[model samples]
Target chain A: APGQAAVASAYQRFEPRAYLRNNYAPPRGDLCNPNGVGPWKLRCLAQTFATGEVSGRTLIDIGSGPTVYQLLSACSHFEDITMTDFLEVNRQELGRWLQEEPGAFNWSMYSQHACLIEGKGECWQDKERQLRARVKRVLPIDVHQPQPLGAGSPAPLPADALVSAFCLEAVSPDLASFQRALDHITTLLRPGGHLLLIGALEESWYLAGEARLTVVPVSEEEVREALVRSGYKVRDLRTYIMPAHLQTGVDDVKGVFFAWAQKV
Target chain B: DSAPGQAAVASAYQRFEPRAYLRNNYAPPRGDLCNPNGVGPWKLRCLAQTFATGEVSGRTLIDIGSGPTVYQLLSACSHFEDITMTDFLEVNRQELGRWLQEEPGAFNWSMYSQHACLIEGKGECWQDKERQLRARVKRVLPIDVHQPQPLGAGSPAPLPADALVSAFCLEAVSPDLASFQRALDHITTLLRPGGHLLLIGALEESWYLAGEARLTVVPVSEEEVREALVRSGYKVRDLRTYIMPAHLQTGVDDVKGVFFAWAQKV
Candidate 1:
């Protein structure tokens, strides 16, 4: 914990570096046209599959950054998606994106944005939208504050879906913390409900703005155990080609796992 | 006036790194702690006007109760022939010891003070007059107004010097105006006919020293200090007040003033 404290303290020296990313980060992938990462990867996994109406259900996005990701995906299937991340910049970035009218999700930016914005909520969505920029009431908790581990019971016992991608591997310093995070993830999901985990692999070390961070490369085995312990009957698991931030030589694109499950 | 915590960490004369000491003490204090700089600006601003009428070359200046920084004496080294430094604390003497060995490359004395030979002692800070009896600093006599024995037998016979400089010191050692005047009379005894004196007292202290540590300076006023100088026959040259910014005010962040003056022994 003291070492973590020093790591956090040293972060002040690198603040100027992270400020850049909080300001300008490019959009995610080549398949910029999105419904959700769900159908695209599902079809790719199935050998023969067609894009269909995904089950519109309540989804919980953990480490949910302020982005077009969950909202775009939720539009296709999930009714209400709760996205969260432990960073103010992430929330602020999301607030600014929500404020963009006409120019933000243009066809040039997100290939099928016109169809994407054809939401049924229409006027109510516009009315509920915020004008002044700031994301207040953001859930403020760093799940990785040294360990007997936090009691994050998600109160209501279980949600229809608990999802996190590129999240758990970040805060855990060692294998045990990683396991602890995974255990927490599994416990948060409900019985017979789905769990979608789209996580990065082979990331090794990446620059989040200027802070050089090392995330544990997830093993396919770890995911299986985590899901099993959380009572999820692992239905399907496969890799999704990632839209990475930087090209690490050899032109090898990184991958993520979209492991879906039925809670038992 | 506060404790010189730096020296307690060192031995008698173990010599600390000069740059580290400078980085600790002289890193300028307020956005408002902008006490004017360089000899020329200092002279024009009327703050250093007490020394304007006379050239510092070949003159002797005694620095009483020098702090851990010793920057004023380092500055005075630019123009005076030699400087005698006295302090009750050995850590202060160690601080001076540390600076004496390696002050040449990094410091430019003329930037803030006139130049001179620096004379200090390992034990009796007041013994600078006796230690440097053969050097130019023989002219710098020590008078500890707290006690009446700086002129005791075997000590160098008091020779009236050209100038006296005490900074951030008076309010620390003495308690009231009368005692402050007695100290000035001690300084007055060190001056010849037409010799000048400069006093830079902390214009804003109301100390509360505790126990046998020392007689805690209860609460004194700036008026008491100004009148004390007048009673001792010195005229005020400048009274500069400064309230430094909180962040730059180091630990205590107190606002203070430097009252400057010059007087003749005629």
Candidate 2:
């Protein structure tokens, strides 16, 4: 019902700390899967990126929440890495993790998992350290704005690759806005640049902190259309279905998807 | 161009079957409308109770996009003396006429009257109620919702209706959002100012099937629905949402919820 308003004010209630604790924390749960929507998403990203050598000059991870797991697989491929979020708390969280703060959430398990996928089981910590060194900045971004991350700054240059997950759909209130956000995000990548995208499927909503956040329910067909309409050629696409046991009733997320595209 | 083209959507409605729709959407004990677990019964009950119990009264009430189904008009038939049912397809119009004549193989709507009577407590018999409904229906006419004059040229004296009730019509036929809003505007032309418009349809549903042919639905969120109503020059009165239960998950469409809204042209 509140979908008519500007997209910036819709996220004023977002608490990045609560979101990180509820979703990214490691000590509380059992072996794996807290939100259950995340681990499978991470696994898909790892498997898709494992097949090729995608080394690039500059890679920007757009709309990154407080979590660092999305960047673990792509950390080794880029000479310079940038992480962006809409909220300051999320940016601070990324800074804390990079600086090894005392109270930072543990993403080491995610690094371990990605490392295992790389067939290097014992060197997970080294990869985590390498990611920490590779990160150049944790900046603020607004997906609704043209030049998303470069609105008020000096002339912003396009990146060699853009990796984003679970951001556009989580914040977009409607399909039109989702398409607009996709268009805005695409401007950050240069021609022939790579884009690795991940998001929910058939999901109408999600639970974050104490609020029930709305997700624009998207089918597989819609996802492909958005990419194609925004002038990107999809190189590969993968999907994961959430098992019934992990439903937990917290959210209605049915499945997840991963698509690798090249800007044309 | 990747969006469903108008010809594709037209092809879908061309194959539409009013009888199969009645059986699939409403019938007896096990129909979607009779099942309490899904939203079918709740939405139908809400519509029936609203018309039967509300202070709404008028000379003419037209059921737009009748689709050979009489469930939406059951209670309203009692309130409005002159009732006209309109559909785009000859098959749908024929289906409505079949039920009016009480011919063999017609879908039974007595169960609906019984269900409504339990809520209305009027204590009316099924046969008498059916007869009253049959008598109240003046004609089943053809209507193209997208046209400026939806009833087309050479329509009867009472052109614009006092109230119009539509269900699963606009979204099912529209190829995109602009078409949906335009159709809504066109439908309002047949409605007098202060005339009531009751709309019921699936929310955020990509597509639905009528028998074997798949029809495209321009998926709309709750916000878009409200915005379209306001933009089309109507003041919304009431809005209700019903989540579809897992048991009603037919492969035809992935309808997350059903929405019912009443508005008056202003």
- In model 1, the runs with Cα more than 4 Å from the true position are A1-57, A76-78, A99-137, A145-157, A241-253, B1-266
Candidate 1, B134-162: lDDT as tens digits: 14333223335454443334555335556
- Identify the runs in model 2 with alpha carbons over 4 angstroms from their true place: A1-264, B1-4, B27-34
Weakest 10 consecutive residues of candidate 1 chain A by summed lDDT: A127-136
Clashes by residue pair, model 2: none
Residue B129's lDDT in candidate 1: 26
Question: Best candidate per TM-score, number?
Answer: 2
How many angstroms is residue B205 displaced in model 1 relative to the true structure, after the best TM-score fit?
Answer: 81
The lDDT, on a scale of 0 to 1, for candidate 1 is: 0.46
Worst 10 residues of 2 chain A by lDDT: A26-35
Give the C-alpha miss distance for residue A241 in model 1, angstroms: 5.3
For candidate 1, lDDT tens digit of each residue in A1-264?
Answer: 643444343333333224333322333333354423333543332221113322435555677554444333333444455555566656555444565544242212232332234333444233223211112223433445431113562333355676665566655555566666666665556666666666654444445545655566554446666777757777656544332243433223245555666678
TM-score of each: 0.36, 0.54
